[PDB]
Amino acid sequence: GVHQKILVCIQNEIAKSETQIRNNISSKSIDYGFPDDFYSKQRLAIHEKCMLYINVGGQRGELLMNQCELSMLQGLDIYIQQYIEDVDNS
Amino acid sequence: VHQKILVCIQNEIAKSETQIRNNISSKSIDYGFPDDFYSKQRLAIHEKCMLYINVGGQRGELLMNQCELSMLQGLDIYIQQYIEDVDNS
């Protein structure tokens, strides 16, 4: 019960990152050269990694799966902002 | 000087790749790695560093090679950590 409320908190932050990533990439300058299916392929890869935690099991395994999926999204968002910064000063 | 550095990194890349696929190929279905897990993850990493074709010059080549190494390192770490978490359950 308390556990489900926790998962909702994380799942909400995941949706914020997803939004931010999609907005960062759809920022239209082809000088950045983002592939069409970039977000989806990268998203899917992140997802498949967090699904491994189906093998830990219990509430602890669901919690790990969700914490990880968020950390990875955050790094992707950060990775994406940095590449744009690197392109601008080029 | 720049080209000699890239070789060093490209050497570290072949190494991480090796350790990673081997940790995954550690055949214990209790870890439950999907069939194309390594290649799919590797390809995602590749598509990320190729963006640095867009930086260009010597700084862009270095970043492309540098980013590829960090992502491969984090993947080995993520994978080792996952294994450790499974071991302990």
Curated annotation (Swiss-Prot), chain A:
Keywords on record: Disulfide bond, Signal
Effect of disrupting the coding gene: Deletion mutant is susceptible to killing by V52 strain in a VgrG3-dependent manner.
Result for mutant: residue 60 to A: Greatly reduces VgrG3 binding affinity
Cysteines paired by S-S bonds: 50-68
Source taxon at top rank: Bacteria
Example GO molecular function: identical protein binding
Biological role stated in the UniProt entry: Immunity protein that plays a role in preventing early activation of toxin VgrG3.
Record text on subunit structure and interactions: Homodimer; dimerization is critical for inhibitory activity. Forms a heterotetramer with VgrG3 composed of one TsiV3 homodimer and two VgrG3 molecules.
Identification of the protein by name: Antitoxin protein TsiV3
Taxonomic placement: Bacteria, Pseudomonadati, Pseudomonadota, Gammaproteobacteria, Vibrionales
Whole-protein residues included: 33 to 122 of 122
